[PDB]
From Swiss-Prot, chains A, B:
Pfam families, sorted: Aminotran_3 (PF00202)
Binding site for L-lysine: 156
Impact after mutating residue 316 to A/S: Loss of activity. Cannot bind pyridoxal 5'-phosphate
SUPFAM superfamilies: PLP-dependent transferases
Residues that, per the record, bind 2-oxoglutarate: 156, 260, 408
Family named by the database record: Belongs to the class-III pyridoxal-phosphate-dependent aminotransferase family.
Gene designation: lat
Name listed for the protein in its UniProt record: L-lysine-epsilon aminotransferase
GO BP terms: antibiotic biosynthetic process; gamma-aminobutyric acid catabolic process
Residues reported in the UniProt entry to bind pyridoxal 5'-phosphate: 114-115, 260
Complex and partners: Homodimer.
UniProt keyword terms in alphabetical order: Aminotransferase, Pyridoxal phosphate, Transferase
Length: 435, 435
């Protein structure tokens, strides 16, 4: 079966709605995907939906003969890491703790898949609230609800479909829990400090009313520190600091979903580190390859929590051992090459170019925004946004849409300024055509 | 970090409740796990909880230099197969369809994780019932419930926690939907045809009453064809044939969860093939490495079902490409070496040995049973069962418990009769000690 027959073969069994290219696994490299059909190179600002930290075939992995042997040993089999431990797994865990660890969150748990990472954070919270309730004479049947935001995306699994609310297509006709949802007071152009503060006060009022009308029954508040799929919506640290206080006042855990923000993209290991808000639990995935949760802070106050009692959380495999070995090596490159700092510096560069674009196309390039390499702008209409994406595709630049009118950039941490310039040049060429 | 330090390093971050050994990834082979600490060999009747078809480091994979190159190409990166297609992926899909495919179930969907496989089958059913309802003038808000069995295990995710009901530890303190659950009329010793028929009639009565009291709101019936975690409980084909008819009478889909039964273990590609009941959807995982669903039969009667409409089902990765490449090679070995037939023949051998054991230890070795290599027996008490497992561990044989009093065998498809003899000899040595 040949590159030119891939879509035909897949189309017999599945809906084939992905990209027109066929990925060349060998010739792709760095910020470039290679189409196996034509040999055309595509500038990658999409990175498998933000899940690739170093891009394709990074030299540090590709040339490391010792790593090849370690990776191959892992890749031949697929152990259940839940039951059976290995050196390969232990090395991953200790380097994870070293590079991405937070001393307040010592408990680690791994699973395949970002939605399941968020679910296990929820399960930890449900268990914690029920037991905390029980310990203070409150009915342990209470503590089953999740406070969350409008525009959130946390996955497409049984619990996360009750939280995710972006496009109706994602959630329609699937059963849901009736959990409290509050407005998202994200930053927008032409609102100053007082205007933002009033927007936040209204979301906070809603949050407080949820807690007061469902007493002892809200186990946690969950949020993306920056909403990704819903449209790269950013929040002031003030908003989360207030939410932190409100969670503590009502004995509820604060969970950040860093599946999309995490692992260096914003310039630090985790976005929450720049907002100066301490979560009780963090869900991670995508760039970490293996998914999971880190937990601590108030979790520890319930001594028989899910991290302390066997068999409360589990899966057959406990994450994919191949992903752990790959992730271990990727983390070592990040640490060795100072890639978080490189994300800060190139993120400032990309953001500066987007500011310039906005200045040159004031009516068209709206709300340029970002934190580190997580950057975006918006268009007047969704028709303009969709056309811009098509025009970029024609120019061999891959970007992702988000929300109704956003174009998002998800470059690899190793992106160069010349590559950023090439992406910007394409947007510049395309814009007069969409107008 | 050295084998003797693995448990210490992991114990800083996680609850370490798995096996005392450290897996040697290189020296393990076939039906044997090697402890890296001692070099002791362990006879493996556990196979990473039934997820390894060929055992460790199969020669057909290990010696295949061309496959090594293909596997390495996949293992270095982790593409989002949802969006970006490859030759490696297309080869996997066409060999899956060839070796495991059913012509009535042409729609394939892949995801990481067995619980999420079952969830996507449920989502297909919820969507189908709502749309089928809508098409016949019934409120499309109806079709949100799942008929299922007592003793079922379908996973630990948001929807499957509402179905799974084995140990209370798995589900306690987690929110659940109130879905209808019926008695499981499994085969037991000392019930003849009439006695079984009466047991089945009672479960069927309960099923019928669920359908009649929740009109148009039950989207599907889900079952394991043989209940695994709940205790290797087997059902007559008559029971499922009746359920098939009842599902059709109430316009509900029949889904089989073959995550544990699937991929040759019972002697055929899928257990349902031996029961002569046609499902609408099958969830698979474990031995297939990549998880997912096959769907068809009545699914197709709703033209805008989730397999036909973009973005109704999704995940970031669409399954792990490394797992797809590994699984492709494993399927080729199964097909080339006739391993399904080998499972039938060695499964008969293992079952015959268990019958002999029961004859020699009538009061102790209870209810020997199996289909193909999926075999089990029970003990008088859970204390006896737990002690037998400890005694086998001491003799370097790994088996799994199930339910309150079952010991289960999950050998690889490539197990030899000498290896089965060694497992049986160990049980024979251990039994006088537990009595
Ligand atoms: C913030 C966030 N949380 C969770 C998920 C779900 O991750 P996965 O697709 O691996 O289930 C996503 C995926 N885009 C996400 O962006
Ligand atoms: C029948 C069945 N269904 C689903 C699952 C869940 O699979 P996973 O652990 O990969 O989520 C299991 C796991 N033992 C199972 O046995």
């Amino acid at each position: 079966t040949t590159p030119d027959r891939v879509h035909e073969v897949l189309g017999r069994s599945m809906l084939v709605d992905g990209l027109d290219i066929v990925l060349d696994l060998t010739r792709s490299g760095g910020s470039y995907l290679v189409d196996a059909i034509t040999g055309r190179r595509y500038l990658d600002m999409f990175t498998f939906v933000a899940s690739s930290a170093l891009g394709m075939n990074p030299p540090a992995l590709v040339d490391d003969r010792e790593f090849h042997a370690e990776l191959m040993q892992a890749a031949l089999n697929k152990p259940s890491n839940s039951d059976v431990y290995s050196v390969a797994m232990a090395r991953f865990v200790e380097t994870f703790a070293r590079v991405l660890g937070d001393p307040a969150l010592p408990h680690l748990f791994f699973v395949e898949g970002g939605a399941l990472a968020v679910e296990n954070a929820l399960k930890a919270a449900f268990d914690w609230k029920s037991r905390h309730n029980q310990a203070h004479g409150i009915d342990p049947a209470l503590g089953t609800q999740v406070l969350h935001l409008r525009g959130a995306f946390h996955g497409r699994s049984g619990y996360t479909l009750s939280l995710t609310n972006t496009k109706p297509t994602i959630t329609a006709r699937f059963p849901k829990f009736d959990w409290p949802r509050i407005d998202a007071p994200y930053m927008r152009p032409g609102l100053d400090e007082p205007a933002m503060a009033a927007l936040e006060a209204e979301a906070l009022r809603q949050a407080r009313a949820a807690f007061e009308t469902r007493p002892h029954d809200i186990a946690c508040f969950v949020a993306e520190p920056i909403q990704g799929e819903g449209g790269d919506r950013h929040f002031r640290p003030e908003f989360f600091a207030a939410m932190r206080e409100l969670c503590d006042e009502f004995d509820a855990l604060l969970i950040f979903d860093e599946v999309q923000t995490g692992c260096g993209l914003t310039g630090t290991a985790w976005a929450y580190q720049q907002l100066d808000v301490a979560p009780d639990i963090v869900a991670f995935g995508k760039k970490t390859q293996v998914c999971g949760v880190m937990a601590g802070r108030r979790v520890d106050e319930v001594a028989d929590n899910v991290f302390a009692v066997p068999s409360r959380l589990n899966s057959t495999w406990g994450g994919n051992l191949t992903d752990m070995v790959r992730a271990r090596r990727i983390l070592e490159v990040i640490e060795a090459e100072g890639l978080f700092e490189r994300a800060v510096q190139h993120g400032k560069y990309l953001r500066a170019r987007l500011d310039e674009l906005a200045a040159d196309f004031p009516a068209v390039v709206l709300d340029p925004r970002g934190r580190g390499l997580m950057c975006a702008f918006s268009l007047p209409t969704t028709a303009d946004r969709d056309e811009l994406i098509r025009q970029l595709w024609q120019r061999a630049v891959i970007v992702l849409p988000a929300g109704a009118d956003t174009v998002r950039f998800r470059p690899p941490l190793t992106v160069s300024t010349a590559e950023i310039d090439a992406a910007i040049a394409a947007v510049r060429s395309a814009l007069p055509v969409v107008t």
